[PDB]
Amino acid sequence: QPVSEVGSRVISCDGGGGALGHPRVYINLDKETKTGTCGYCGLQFR
Amino acid sequence: PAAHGVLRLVMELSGEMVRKCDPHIGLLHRGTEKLIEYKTYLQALPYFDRLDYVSMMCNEQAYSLAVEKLLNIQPPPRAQWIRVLFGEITRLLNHIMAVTTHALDIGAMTPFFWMFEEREKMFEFYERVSGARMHAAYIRPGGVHQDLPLGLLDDIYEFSKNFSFRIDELEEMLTNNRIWRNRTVDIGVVTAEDALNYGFSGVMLRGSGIQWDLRKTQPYDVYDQVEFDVPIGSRGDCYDRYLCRVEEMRQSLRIISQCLNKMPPGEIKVDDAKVSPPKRAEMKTSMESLIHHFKLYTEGYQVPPGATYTAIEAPKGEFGVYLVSDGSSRPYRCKIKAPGFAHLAGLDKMSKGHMLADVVAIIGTQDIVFGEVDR
Amino acid sequence: LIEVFVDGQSVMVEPGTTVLQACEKVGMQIPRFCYHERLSVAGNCRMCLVEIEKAPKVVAACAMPVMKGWNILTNSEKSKKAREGVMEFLLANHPLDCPICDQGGECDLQDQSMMFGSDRSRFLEGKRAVEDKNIGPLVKTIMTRCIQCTRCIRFASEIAGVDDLGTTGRGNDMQVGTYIEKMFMSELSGNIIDICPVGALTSKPYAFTARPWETRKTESIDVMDAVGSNIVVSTRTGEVMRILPRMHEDINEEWISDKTR
Amino acid sequence: DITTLTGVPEEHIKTRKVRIFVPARNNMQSGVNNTKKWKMEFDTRERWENPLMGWSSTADPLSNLVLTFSTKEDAVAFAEKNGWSFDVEERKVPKPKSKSYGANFSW
Amino acid sequence: NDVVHKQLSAFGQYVAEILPKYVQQVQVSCFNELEIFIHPDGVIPVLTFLRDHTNAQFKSLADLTAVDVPTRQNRFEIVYNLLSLRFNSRIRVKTYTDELTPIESSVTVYKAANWYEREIWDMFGVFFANHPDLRRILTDYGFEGHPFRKDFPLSGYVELRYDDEVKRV
Amino acid sequence: LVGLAVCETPHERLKILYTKILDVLGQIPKNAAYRKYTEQITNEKLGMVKAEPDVKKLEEQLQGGQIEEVILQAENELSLARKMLRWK
Amino acid sequence: DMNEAKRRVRELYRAWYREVPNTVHLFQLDISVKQGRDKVREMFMKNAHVTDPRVVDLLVIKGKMELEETINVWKQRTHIMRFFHETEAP
Numbered sequence A: 001q002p003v004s005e006v007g008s009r010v011i012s013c014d015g016g017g018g019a020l021g022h023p024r025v026y027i028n029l030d031k032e033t034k035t036g037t038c039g040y041c042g043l044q045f046r
Numbered sequence B: 001p002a003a004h005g006v007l008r009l010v011m012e013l014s015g016e017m018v019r020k021c022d023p024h025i026g027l028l029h030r031g032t033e034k035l036i037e038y039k040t041y042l043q044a045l046p047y048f049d050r051l052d053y054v055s056m057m058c059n060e061q062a063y064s065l066a067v068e069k070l071l072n073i074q075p076p077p078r079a080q081w082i083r084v085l086f087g088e089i090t091r092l093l094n095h096i097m098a099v100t101t102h103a104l105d106i107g108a109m110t111p112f113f114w115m116f117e118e119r120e121k122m123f124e125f126y127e128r129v130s131g132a133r134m135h136a137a138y139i140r141p142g143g144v145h146q147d148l149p150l151g152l153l154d155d156i157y158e159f160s161k162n163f164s165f166r167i168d169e170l171e172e173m174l175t176n177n178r179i180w181r182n183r184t185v186d187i188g189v190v191t192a193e194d195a196l197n198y199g200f201s202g203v204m205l206r207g208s209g210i211q212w213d214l215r216k217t218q219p220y221d222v223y224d225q226v227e228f229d230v231p232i233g234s235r236g237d238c239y240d241r242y243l244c245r246v247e248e249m250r251q252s253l254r255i256i257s258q259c260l261n262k263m264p265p266g267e268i269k270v271d272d273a274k275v276s277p278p279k280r281a282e283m284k285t286s287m288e289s290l291i292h293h294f295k296l297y298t299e300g301y302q303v304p305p306g307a308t309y310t311a312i313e314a315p316k317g318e319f320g321v322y323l324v325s326d327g328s329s330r331p332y333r334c335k336i337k338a339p340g341f342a343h344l345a346g347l348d349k350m351s352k353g354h355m356l357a358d359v360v361a362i363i364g365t366q367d368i369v370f371g372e373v374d375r
Numbered sequence C: 001l002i003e004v005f006v007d008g009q010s011v012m013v014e015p016g017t018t019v020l021q022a023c024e025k026v027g028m029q030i031p032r033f034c035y036h037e038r039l040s041v042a043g044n045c046r047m048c049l050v051e052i053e054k055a056p057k058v059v060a061a062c063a064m065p066v067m068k069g070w071n072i073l074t075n076s077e078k079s080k081k082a083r084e085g086v087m088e089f090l091l092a093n094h095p096l097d098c099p100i101c102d103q104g105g106e107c108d109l110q111d112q113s114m115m116f117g118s119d120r121s122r123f124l125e126g127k128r129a130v131e132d133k134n135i136g137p138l139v140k141t142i143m144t145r146c147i148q149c150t151r152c153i154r155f156a157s158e159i160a161g162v163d164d165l166g167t168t169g170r171g172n173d174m175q176v177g178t179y180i181e182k183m184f185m186s187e188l189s190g191n192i193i194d195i196c197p198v199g200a201l202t203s204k205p206y207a208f209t210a211r212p213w214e215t216r217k218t219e220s221i222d223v224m225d226a227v228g229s230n231i232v233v234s235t236r237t238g239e240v241m242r243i244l245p246r247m248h249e250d251i252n253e254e255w256i257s258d259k260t261r
Numbered sequence D: 001d002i003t004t005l006t007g008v009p010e011e012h013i014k015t016r017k018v019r020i021f022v023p024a025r026n027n028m029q030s031g032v033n034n035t036k037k038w039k040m041e042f043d044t045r046e047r048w049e050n051p052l053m054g055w056s057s058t059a060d061p062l063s064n065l066v067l068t069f070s071t072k073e074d075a076v077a078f079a080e081k082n083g084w085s086f087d088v089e090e091r092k093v094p095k096p097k098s099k100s101y102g103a104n105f106s107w
Numbered sequence E: 001n002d003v004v005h006k007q008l009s010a011f012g013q014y015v016a017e018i019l020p021k022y023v024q025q026v027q028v029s030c031f032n033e034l035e036i037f038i039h040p041d042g043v044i045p046v047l048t049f050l051r052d053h054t055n056a057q058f059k060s061l062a063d064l065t066a067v068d069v070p071t072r073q074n075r076f077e078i079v080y081n082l083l084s085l086r087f088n089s090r091i092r093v094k095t096y097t098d099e100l101t102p103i104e105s106s107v108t109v110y111k112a113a114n115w116y117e118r119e120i121w122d123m124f125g126v127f128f129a130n131h132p133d134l135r136r137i138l139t140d141y142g143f144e145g146h147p148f149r150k151d152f153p154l155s156g157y158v159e160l161r162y163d164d165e166v167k168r169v
Numbered sequence F: 001l002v003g004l005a006v007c008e009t010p011h012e013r014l015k016i017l018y019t020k021i022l023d024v025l026g027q028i029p030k031n032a033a034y035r036k037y038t039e040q041i042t043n044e045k046l047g048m049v050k051a052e053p054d055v056k057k058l059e060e061q062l063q064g065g066q067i068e069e070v071i072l073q074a075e076n077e078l079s080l081a082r083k084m085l086r087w088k
Numbered sequence G: 001d002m003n004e005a006k007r008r009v010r011e012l013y014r015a016w017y018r019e020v021p022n023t024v025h026l027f028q029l030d031i032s033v034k035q036g037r038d039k040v041r042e043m044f045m046k047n048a049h050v051t052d053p054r055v056v057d058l059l060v061i062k063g064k065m066e067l068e069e070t071i072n073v074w075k076q077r078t079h080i081m082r083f084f085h086e087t088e089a090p
């Protein structure tokens, strides 16, 4: 998958949809040196 | 076939009269109570369906009461209305199965097939709300599991209005059918007091005319708010018990009306998340929700240490749960009263000297189910 | 040695000594986090608040020493509202990680949430979350699940003796992670994996491999050293999973080495 | 002695031992509740692996058995009634300790 | 309800005074369940009166449960539910017993207890005196050791299997 | 009730009931409170017996459905008393 | 006291011993007719060191039920052949 990127900072990943994916979690992006992989989803962020 | 797959009634018959029937239960003692002790409360619940399996809901209701008293907690009213409603559809299930197979034992054959169509239509309901055709682990200690689907109640209505013709036609094949009368009318009478000494329960009492009945006597749910006529028997012969079965069917069919007409909106699980797991939309988006979810399924809820005996009007008789919370999440001991057990104990007194066919019919009036006896 | 009343009954308690230690002496157990004997007392994480028999406001249980015939209602309702009060705050940001967090079987925060915390959520905004701080071959820091019971630093400065790690920043954003990338290696680095209140710090080598309700917990002693410290080996059926220290006054006292771990 | 009354095979009243103790606190926990009250764990025996699926197939009749108690003497006497070999261990309550927030500020 | 708790309380006092050669204590579980204790020798006389009128027309055993507990000077702890009809209410007497002391059977007093004597006998060691016929039920034939002994593995010590060389299970 | 057997003119039999009652319990030492209570209600009920020659309201007076059974209840109390002093 | 109970057990041995050939006959057991007897004697040796007062009479209570079963044809060929452990690996 392509790595999703947002200019903001903290983002919330639910794994797609509401109440059909993993528990809502916020992936921090304090370090631009690395991608923000989701805990359950496995989807990277930056 | 008359031994219900799991009975070994050895008997020292004469020429063709019995001299003493000698029941030997335990042929299906799966060993339940030992198992229950090792499993937490929520994980113990299914065993109860596996008990009096013909009457699968009322057992669950018996348990959920048995815990709620210990847990000191009260279901939201709608849940109580479901709990009584399916308590009653199940009332009809056991009575159908009872009157029917009791007929099949004496060769009527037909009424069977006329009814299991209906009984199948009832399993369409367990199918619809619980997702299982039977053994619907649906009643919960906290109240009830998922809410029932919108499309259901009219569907129950449409059936219930038309069921009565069916039960009636059954009654035309039986109650007047004087062959059937002669086979079961002078057997097997039990003295009204002598019942009480043996602790007969439910219909086996009412057949001998004693007034007692737990729903009227020590009501546990909205039975305060339903009105129905208990049918007392008289002679105590199998025939009276039969008419009690039928009439109680009609009366349950009365209850369904009232429950349909007063079925309040509101929640169904108890609010107390410490006991009732959070709804999925919620547990996935707030911390405490997820945590109580997690612990409710991992360790399970604790119960205050204590002991009790609840009992309710299960279709065969009162169903009785004696259990003792140690305070841990695993109940310490959970003796399960089985109404059938007492009956079958009383059988040999009730059946001395009777013809060998009549002992077969009289096993059936006892309407016993061995899965419940062997617990 | 002063008389003092735990809620009702009199108790001839030792002079001074914290209210917490008093109820510990009667055996009733106050909810706790930051405090830890064999470590040091601290005023953070005010989950130990308890109500004086008369004085209107609650005080930290591990703070005030008992004296002069005090009575203390641990079960007093105001105490209970206090505890719910705090617990909602702790849970206001700890990430929904219970299924994946390796601490999940017995994290003290869960059980404290069950016994005391109000069940409904009523936070309705956005949790803060923070980047990881890599630390060594062993410990798997995750933070975010961090709750600033400083504890681990009080471990480091007062037992490992290393003071490499420490608190940083103020308000929210303050972090118990050490500033600068530098790795923290020490011989007592392993025991923090035990000491860490939650899943914020858990052993990488054992990670994910098992769950607490599963493993059997045999008692024995270490052999890597002749020091002979007591332990609780933990096995998931026919195979060892993880080692933990078993407290014993003459030797290990709740601690364990590291090469042995 | 009630060995004849119990149907237990001689092997397991003989060639194994009970191991009475009051359980240690899980150290990950700060809790104390489960610590108290004697229990009567037996010794472990062999447990291999299922050739299929890798399950931990097991031979011994009674590995998982465990029993709470209120007093140690009652426990020892208990196993004695059973005619059981035993390994009684001491209750090991932590020594009380002095604590002082201000001792941190001596100098 | 306070009311029921009252009536059961006073009634517990009532029986407590009527026959105190043996009522160790008449605790009321707060959710309205009375339950007096009995010295094990005293089983028949109490239960006897328990059918006999004063108000204690508590006919029909609901059950004869046998709670076990490894501790205590005598482990097994027998329990008797009872129901009175006209005053529709339930009580629950109970005793205690040694592994070896033979307490008497209570079949005559409550009438429908014949099956239970056999039950508890085959689910426990405990023996009931003056019982016409204790024998195994809820088991196999041999089997031996009582289950529900609170010890004793659920997996038991045995298994059946059919074996062709001998052509038999 | 099926076992229950109709018994006309209860009253006589009743008088034999309460008299056999008071007599068989008449051996009770004042000690135990059993004699106290059981006589207490007994004499009250019996007082109603003399008080109520009619049956139709009589069983509205004993507060027990079908006095015809409760005579056998008292019959149970008779053997009860037969046991009371064997129990001493 | 002991001895009063030992006579009980001897009575029990008489009953078992005499009954055994009937057991082999009626059950169609092909065990050597002697072997059952010997095995009986052995089972009688199994508790041949019990010394408590009440425990031994309790032992003959549990001893009655078995002959009680074989005489009533309760149990079966399987159930009574069970004692010989014949399928076990040495």
Ligand code: SF4
Binding pocket: C094, C095, C096, C097, C098, C099, C100, C101, C102, C103, C104, C106, C107, C108, C109, C110, C145, C198, C199, C200
């Ligand atoms: S460990 Fe941290 S995350 Fe896992 S459950 Fe306990 S608190 Fe929630």
Ligand code: SF4
Binding pocket: C145, C146, C147, C148, C149, C150, C151, C152, C153, C176, C195, C196, C197, C198, C200, C201
């Ligand atoms: S490090 Fe361990 S102790 Fe220090 S804050 Fe993070 S979690 Fe609490």
Ligand code: FES
Binding pocket: C032, C033, C034, C035, C042, C043, C044, C045, C046, C047, C048, C049, C060, C061, C062, C063
């Ligand atoms: S320990 Fe008392 S404040 Fe945290």
